[PDB]
Design a protein around this ligand. Structure first.
Ligand SMILES: Nc1ncnc2c1ncn2[C@@H]1O[C@H](COP(=O)(O)OP(=O)(O)OC[C@H]2O[C@@H]([n+]3cccc(C(=O)O)c3)[C@H](O)[C@@H]2O)[C@@H](O)[C@H]1O
Ligand SMILES: Nc1ncnc2c1ncn2[C@@H]1O[C@H](COP(=O)(O)OP(=O)(O)OC[C@H]2O[C@@H]([n+]3cccc(C(=O)O)c3)[C@H](O)[C@@H]2O)[C@@H](O)[C@H]1O
Ligand SMILES: [Ca+2]
Lengths: 189, 189
């Protein structure tokens, strides 16, 4: 009966398009809880210049402070290794029986979902919520939920690329995160 | 030799994509001055539900506060009527000779520049600076400047439409503008 939304990501760093996704899903679904779920290492991704965990969590808290909703689920950081969503959700669900689970992903992840670990079991445990990325609308099958957001082409890779070349990231992240990155020397080469 | 940028708009309301445009242009061209230039009534657009002029100026100043650069140029508000850019620039330039003038527009205005008043004369007085809108890349002729920005599909129409239907505009405008719209009851029906 309780509605719980989880939004998974490497969040390296979290940015203004992640904020728009979270805001739109939260206001459309009106869940009882909303969790940002930072991975330790997200599968299907290379983890190069691994800054460590405290920095990523701090910037996610700065987003929550500004949005005025949300919590961090640190299960994946505690577990370490490759962060397979099926392992996360199996454990989360038995700590929160009697609630409906919603897992938010963008278009890029939706299109490679057959490559996720234990995907047939995970699709029975959560309702996937898919937001449009690099296009203006997203179609899904009737078992899933599509949420249409204003299209915003910002990525974490773009942010790290800019910082390394000395280009501004003003607006692309909130002011708090911008000053944190500069202040801590994150992504500088 | 002094470099001056003007960024014209109806700004009804100013929003997060306008801030991205301004930030990208400012950091790329490093002008000596940067002016937000609000029109009274911009040509080639319908002006139904005309709010007080002071509301628009207040929201623009909140963007300036956040960005940390820029000033309002109120020339068109003082003049009233249809706000033809040729008239604006002819007057502005006779108060700022010895300066190079740059005028920022997005793709939609670029594509209809033949419909602008006295366009042949205006192209001699300013360098047009074009940012991509509704696409990822903008080509221009060699006399103009293209600045590539992260594509962000937010419009003022979107903002007004959301507000009227009771939909959230969180993140799509800054928090100060969001609370200002709500408290002044703007765009409510
Ligand atoms: N501009 C934008 N517009 C709309 N959506 C945007 C976006 N930028 C990122 N996104 C989305 O936000 C999210 C965060 O992106 P980013 O921080 O890169 O994170 P990402 O590496 O994309 O991982 C997203 C989640 O999927 C999980 N996953 C991925 C692959 C395999 C498996 C498995 O279990 O086998 C699990 C992963 O652990 C994590 O919880 C993603 O869903 C992404 O599509
Ligand atoms: N998401 C987005 N991404 C990239 N660019 C975006 C954008 N949203 C708006 N823009 C752009 O920002 C600007 C502000 O938009 P908005 O507030 O609607 O304003 P708008 O009505 O488009 O007017 C822009 C300027 O052009 C002038 N103009 C227009 C037509 C005819 C003539 C004439 O002299 O005959 C003069 C007008 O007076 C004003 O200074 C525009 O350049 C628009 O293209
Ligand atoms: Ca809590």
């Amino acid at each position: 009966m309780k509605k719980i939304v989880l939004y998974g990501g490497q969040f390296n760093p979290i940015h203004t398009a992640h904020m728009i996704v979270a805001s739109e899903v939260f206001h459309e679904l009106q869940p009882d809880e909303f969790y940002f779920l930072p991975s330790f290492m997200s599968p299907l991704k290379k983890h190069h210049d691994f800054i460590d965990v405290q920095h990523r969590l701090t910037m996610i808290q700065m987003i929550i402070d500004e949005l005025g909703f949300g919590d961090i689920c640190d299960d994946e950081i505690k577990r370490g290794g490759q962060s397979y969503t099926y392992d996360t959700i199996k454990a989360f669900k038995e700590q929160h029986k009697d609630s409906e689970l919603y897992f938010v992903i963008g278009t890029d992840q939706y299109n490679q979902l057959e490559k996720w670990y234990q995907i047939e079991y995970l699709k029975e445990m959560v309702t996937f919520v898919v937001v449009n990325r690099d296009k203006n609308s997203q179609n899904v099958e009737n078992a899933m939920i599509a949420i249409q957001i204003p299209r915003v082409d910002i990525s974490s890779t773009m942010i790290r690329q800019r910082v390394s070349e000395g280009k501004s990231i003003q607006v692309l992240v909130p002011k708090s995160v911008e000053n944190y990155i500069k202040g801590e020397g994150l992504y500088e080469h």
